């Protein structure tokens, strides 16, 4: 009749299922779910676009460091994977392959021009490289102004693991910036976005840390 | 008397004022022997190095709780430690592994007794560092649990996955399979307590370049 | 929950009560590297001992 439903097939559908046969983790992800009598599963949209995407959500900038320059002196700068913010949503992934943006903010309350470069590998590549920055992709930035400027791929390294801090293959990069214009307190606030990342590989959900 | 070269694999040899070479009478240079001495395949020599191997077994017994670790294996150093194991020979002298793997589990179970141990595979890269990781989630991982009842072997296999194109042979550069206690076992007395678990190996996608001096190590990647 | 055997080179191995195997989502098996990284062609390691 209409109520009641019986096997002894269908088992599987009705939710027994032997975990110690998994087939591939991949092959779970096409396993119909569970359902009773009544339950509708339906799956409705009620954005057009999604922001469980890889694509759109780490579109959202997310910002690491903010410090003041007062000398012409080019600044180190190193940029770690995102914590504490949606970017650490990125945390499950080792390896990552993308071009990524590079929102920086200028403050300046004399006025300063200041220049911004971006280098996958560090301050040494077996030499000083650092001599002169104009040469490696500069890109020079307006007195209270800000830019877009994003950083194409070029590293030794096809992957890079997100987890570690190592400063050769572990970090996104290494940023570099001098101001010019004689001036002191000038301020930057510096942005980093993905732009269609290539994730791959997982990992198991990171422990928050309270001692660090 | 002209330039004749000549190459095999890496050598070559280039020779001036050459002369042309000799044969004994009615040669017949056919590799094989028909009739056959040997039942074997001709193919296996070179194949030989894939031949799978027991691994680095444990013993898992009740007294570890869950979370505990039963036995470690560091996955590309672990197929030649010794000069025993048959894919030894012709790794001391390639530098490096595109090699992909295959890990088989073993395990036995008196009937009688539950738990399961867990089967992950951790690269080196994210090998570097337990303490960031929550154990509840370790199935994202590419694995296998094991029942202690009803399951008598875990067949996983696993693709070449690591930051650089090519991986160091001396290193532990692939990282390795390690194998958690899921959850404590139970025993009824009287019962063996030892559970012994020994992962059975193999090795699949052969790869070898980039040649050295027999005993010395060399850097690539870094 | 099946016999499977499995056999490379001279070596096999004959289980009971198998479980079926795992693979990493999107897995690619192929052995050769495109792009190369190396210039060599892979038949060098087997072929080497002819040097």
């Known amino acids: 009749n209409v109520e009641a439903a019986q096997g002894e097939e269908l088992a599987t559908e009705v939710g027994l ?22 339950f509708k599963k339906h799956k409705v949209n009620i954005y057009a676009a999604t922001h469980t995407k890889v ?12 410090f003041n320059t007062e000398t012409a002196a080019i600044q180190k700068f190193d940029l770690h994977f995102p914590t504490s913010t949606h970017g650490a949503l990125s945390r499950f992934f080792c390896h990552w392959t993308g071009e990524l943006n590079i929102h920086i903010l200028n403050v300046s309350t004399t006025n300063a021009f200041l220049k911004v470069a971006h280098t996958w590998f560090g301050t040494d590549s077996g030499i000083a490289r650092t001599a002169t920055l104009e040469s490696n992709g500069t890109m020079i930035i307006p007195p209270n102004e800000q830019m877009t400027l994003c950083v194409p791929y070029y590293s030794e390294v096809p992957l890079r693991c997100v987890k570690g801090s190592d400063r050769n293959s572990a970090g996104l990069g290494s940023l570099f910036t001098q101001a010019v214009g004689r001036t002191i307190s000038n301020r930057v606030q510096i942005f980093v976005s993905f732009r269609c990342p290539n994730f791959f590989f997982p990992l198991p959900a990171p422990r928050e840390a309270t001692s660090a | 008397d ?62 570890q709780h869950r979370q505990a670790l039963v036995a470690s294996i560091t996955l590309l150093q672990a197929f030649w430690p010794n000069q025993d194991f048959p894919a030894w020979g012709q790794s001391r002298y390639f530098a490096a592994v595109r090699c992909g793997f295959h890990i088989q589990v073993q395990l036995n179970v008196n009937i009688g007794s539950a738990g399961c141990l867990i089967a992950a595979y951790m690269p080196k890269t994210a090998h570097d560092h337990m303490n960031t990781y929550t154990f509840g989630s370790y199935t994202n991982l590419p694995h296998v649990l094991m029942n202690a009842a009803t399951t008598s072997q875990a067949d996983l296999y696993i693709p070449y996955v690591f930051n650089h194109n090519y991986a160091r042979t001396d290193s532990d550069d692939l990282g390795g399979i390690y194998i958690w206690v899921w959850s404590a076992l139970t025993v009824p007395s009287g019962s063996p307590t030892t559970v012994d678990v020994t992962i059975f190996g193999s090795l699949l996608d052969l790869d070898f370049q980039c040649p050295r001096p027999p005993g010395a190590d060399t850097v690539i990647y870094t």
């Open chain 1, 17 to 38: 299922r032997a975990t110690e046969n998994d087939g591939s983790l991949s092959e779970q992800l096409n396993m119909s779910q569970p359902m009773f009598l009544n």
């Open chain 1, 55 to 66: 694509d759109h959500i780490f579109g959202r900038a997310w910002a690491v460091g903010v």
């Open chain 2, 2 to 63: 002209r330039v004749a070269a000549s190459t095999t694999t890496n050598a070559g040899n280039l020779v001036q004022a050459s002369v042309a070479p000799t044969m004994p009478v009615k040669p017949d240079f056919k590799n094989t022997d028909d009739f056959l001495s040997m039942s074997y395949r001709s193919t296996t020599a070179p194949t030989n190095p894939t031949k799978m191997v027991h691994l680095a077994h444990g013993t898992w017994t009740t007294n």
